[PDB]
């Protein structure tokens, strides 16, 4: 239950305004003060209030009290109000701090769920490597078998080539060295061509 905002509207700290309103309709705005004057004067004149040393003790206490409230009442009011505002702000901030803590916890959990959803890359990487290794070995096997068969065929062609080479070289130098082993016709024909030199 929330407290009200304002009190009961006393006057002079002694008399609530309900009384002045209650005497308004029949004796105007001056009814209460006329009644107070009348009651004071009747108490005085008939020794209901005996003036004594307590009159002046009471006057001094009442003066100190009125001066005290008038001067240090604003300060005490603002002190109480600041105490309440500080407690309220501290409680509100503690509330917001707990809200922020649990919102951060929810976010952290959803992030962990994102990670655990990202988990599958380990296995697709391993599967990638298995497939690639098997394909690499297949292609290495096909190049090995191709290149080996081709190497044998090219060895045949190379032995044939260098056999032909050595043989043709020996052939040509044999035929030159062997025609050396073999003529007035050329004797005359030399002079014939020298004449044909012109």
């Amino acid at each position: 239950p929330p407290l009200p905002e304002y009190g009961g509207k006393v006057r002079y700290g002694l008399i609530p305004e309900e009384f002045f309103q209650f005497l308004y309709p029949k004796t105007g705005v001056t009814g209460p003060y006329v009644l107070g004057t009348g009651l004071i004067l009747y108490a005085l004149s008939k020794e209901i209030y005996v003036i004594s040393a307590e009159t002046f003790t009471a006057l001094s206490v009442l003066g100190v009290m009125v001066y005290g409230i008038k001067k240090y009442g604003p300060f005490v009011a603002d002190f109480a109000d600041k105490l309440n505002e500080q407690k309220l702000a501290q409680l509100e901030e503690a509330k917001q701090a707990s809200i922020q803590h649990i919102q951060n916890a929810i976010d952290t959990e959803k992030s962990q769920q994102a990670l655990v959803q990202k988990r599958h890359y380990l296995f697709d990487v391993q599967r990638n490597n298995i497939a690639m290794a098997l394909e690499v070995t297949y292609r290495e096997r096909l190049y090995r078998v191709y290149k080996e068969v081709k190497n044998r065929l090219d060895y045949h062609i190379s032995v044939q080539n260098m056999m032909r080479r050595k043989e043709q070289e020996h052939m040509i130098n044999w035929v030159e060295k062997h025609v050396v082993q073999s003529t007035i016709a050329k004797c005359i024909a030399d002079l014939k061509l020298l004449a044909k030199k012109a």
């Binding site: 239950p1 929330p2 407290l3 309220l88 409680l91 509100e92 503690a94 509330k95 707990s98 809200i99 649990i102 919102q103 916890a105 929810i106 959990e109 959803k110 962990q112 769920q113 990670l115 655990v116 959803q117 990202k118 988990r119 599958h120 890359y121 380990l122 296995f123 697709d124 990487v125 391993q126 599967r127 990638n128 490597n129 298995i130 497939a131 690639m132 290794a133 098997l134 394909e135 690499v136 070995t137 297949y138 292609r139 290495e140 096997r141 096909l142 190049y143 078998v145 191709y146 290149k147 068969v149 081709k150 044998r152 065929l153 045949h156 062609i157 044939q160």
Partner: protein, 156 residues
């Protein structure tokens, strides 16, 4: 040859710190096998016999070399290793889904509790028991300190 394209930082996030080395070795072997599949084509160029029919003067040996080659059954290696990592992936997806269900339980609890904190009574209409059941940290230890003020005097 249908591969799984991969993120590498994402691959990094899901690796516990007791098997980082294995993650790095998987990465290095992935890169090595990509490289080695790059630098060799798919099928060898089967050389025409023409240059090997008309220039090997040897007696029919080329023909049996080519017969042994056209009839060669080169062994395609089979997997024998992917099915078991698929089984491990199945088990892992099981563990992941159960942990996810637990985290969803915790998340629904947090959302209930955050609705509780979000709907507090205004603080100027709040008894002290309402505070002690809202933030139970704020309750006087009437167990250890049984006498007033129910807390250490320095705390006041």
């Amino acid at each position: 040859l249908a591969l799984k394209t991969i993120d590498w930082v994402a691959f990094a996030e899901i690796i516990p710190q007791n098997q980082k080395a294995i993650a790095s070795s998987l990465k290095s072997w992935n890169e090595t096998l990509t490289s080695r599949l790059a630098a060799l084509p798919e099928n060898p160029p089967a050389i025409d016999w023409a240059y090997y029919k008309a220039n090997v003067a040897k007696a029919g040996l080329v023909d049996d070399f080519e017969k042994k080659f056209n009839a060669l059954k080169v062994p395609v290696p089979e997997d024998k290793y992917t099915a078991q990592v698929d089984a491990e992936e199945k088990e892992d997806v099981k563990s992941c889904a159960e942990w996810v269900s637990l985290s969803k339980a915790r998340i629904v609890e947090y959302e209930k509790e955050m609705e509780k904190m979000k709907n507090l009574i205004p603080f100027d209409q709040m008894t002290i028991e309402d505070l002690n059941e809202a933030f139970p940290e704020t309750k006087l230890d009437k167990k250890k300190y049984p006498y007033w003020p129910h807390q250490p005097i320095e705390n006041l």
